[PDB]
Design a binder for this molecule. Structure first.
Ligand SMILES: OC[C@H]1O[C@@](CO)(O[C@H]2O[C@H](CO)[C@@H](O)[C@H](O)[C@H]2O)[C@@H](O)[C@@H]1O
Ligand SMILES: OC[C@H]1O[C@@](CO)(O[C@H]2O[C@H](CO)[C@@H](O)[C@H](O)[C@H]2O)[C@@H](O)[C@@H]1O
Ligand SMILES: [Ca+2]
Ligand SMILES: [Ca+2]
Ligand SMILES: [Mn+2]
Ligand SMILES: [Mn+2]
Lengths: 241, 241
């Protein structure tokens, strides 16, 4: 299809169109990307991802069209401690994408240790909400919590300082305009605190014509819950000048 | 998801979200439901169906919600014979639906012969465009070409006279309003000729909560091409007051 859109105001337990990878599972009408004990508390060393089953036609070689898409979602992070890790990310990748070996902790379940920074060894665009930046294990990270745009590397091509608020939902709007090649990210907390980051990227040279969209989250030695509360997506193929 | 929509203004050969059954295949940016020779001419004894991969949430028991959906599509039928057969149909059935054994010809690839008219033995709602009504063969049909609404049986719960026009596209709008429980059908030819038929049905008592939508067509002794040219579908769960 040239156009596709779906919306999850909440996440009831009877899902049919979600691909669950790792420890991701539905609990209390929300998607818990990372494992949690019976008490509902986060645990260490866990990775989980979800992907919508239907493939998205991102671009079409023949017609020379590229899709304009918008992804809106909200999530909350909660941890008994305060050093919650490692973060959640919205990502777009080839349809057969699976959790890379050893992609836990700081790699957010998106990259392999040996290629995490090799741009010609990956095919993935992601918007990360990174809460852990210890310079010994996350050497590629700026020294503070941040929202980043990742293009084939765990080392963000663009970042903006961000504030982690335990238990508070962050509302996010991610949009890609094929006309200007701009991938814009706008995140806001209910009190109006706003964060914005954008980057110009030609999706055609990074991803295949058909892709799958979803989320990924991980906790290494440090942990926190990564709860996806809602999600709506829309893509429409458009002719570009 | 509570809502889903997708649009196929045309059908390029490079598809990823369509489930092809029987002889269905894409040719010339259109879906040829029934088999055609190398020259594109229709042949006898052929059945084919397509379904969108993503399951549609038709209704939700817990929240007492029922989906409001709309299916707009266009098709054309062609045949050198004076009595092209057998017809095409838009249908809604359980997710694991497959072509029943011996459902060719007049059964439109939707029902098995032994239970084609046993309503308690089927789970399907279909809008058929029936061009073959030989009273000695398809004994259940009125004696003329017609549009029919099928609910768990090949013997339509309702039909209206329709005119078959060789090689002319028919545009159809199928809608369901959960408030009134009216399943409405409006079809038109490019010259304005209009056909309308409506039926009241509670989908909750006929179909499971999750279903798949698609098209089916077949040709028995008599044949004709059944070309699906375009298709857009949208559904959203609503509260039924
Ligand atoms: O306790 C965390 C501590 O260990 C290191 C590695 O020595 O980081 C681990 O835990 C982090 C948070 O869960 C992950 O991001 C990282 O991938 C993992 O190696 C330290 O840097 C950190 O201080
Ligand atoms: O030519 C139609 C003639 O043959 C039979 C089967 O012997 O019907 C077949 O063809 C029809 C038209 O394609 C189908 O409707 C029917 O399902 C199929 O069996 C006869 O009953 C009919 O007289
Ligand atoms: Ca990090
Ligand atoms: Ca018939
Ligand atoms: Mn980072
Ligand atoms: Mn009929």
């Amino acid at each position: 299809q040239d156009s596709l859109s779906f919306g999850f105001p909440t996440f009831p337990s009877d899902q049919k169109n979600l691909i669950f990878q790792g420890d991701a599972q539905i609990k209390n009408n929300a998607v818990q990307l990372t494992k949690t004990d019976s008490n509902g508390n986060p645990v260490a060393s866990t990775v989980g991802r979800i992907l919508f089953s239907a493939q998205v036609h991102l671009w079409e070689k023949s017609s020379s069209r590229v899709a304009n898409f918008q992804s809106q979602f909200s999530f909350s992070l909660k941890s008994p401690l305060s050093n919650g890790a490692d973060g959640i990310a919205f990502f777009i990748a080839p349809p057969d994408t699976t959790i890379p070996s050893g992609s836990g902790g700081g790699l957010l379940g998106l990259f392999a240790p040996g290629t995490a920074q090799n741009t010609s060894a990956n095919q993935v665009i992601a918007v990360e909400f990174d809460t852990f930046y210890a310079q010994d294990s996350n050497t590629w990270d700026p020294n503070y919590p941040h929202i980043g745009i990742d293009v084939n590397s765990i080392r963000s091509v663009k970042t903006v300082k961000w504030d982690r608020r335990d238990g508070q939902s962050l509302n996010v709007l991610v949009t890609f305009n094929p006309s200007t090649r701009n991938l814009d990210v706008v995140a806001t907390y209910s009190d109006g605190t706003r964060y914005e980051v954008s980057y110009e990227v030609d999706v055609r040279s990074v991803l295949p014509e058909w892709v799958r969209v979803g989320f990924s989250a991980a906790s290494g030695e440090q942990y926190q819950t990564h709860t996806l509360e809602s999600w709506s997506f829309t893509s429409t193929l458009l002719y570009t000048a």
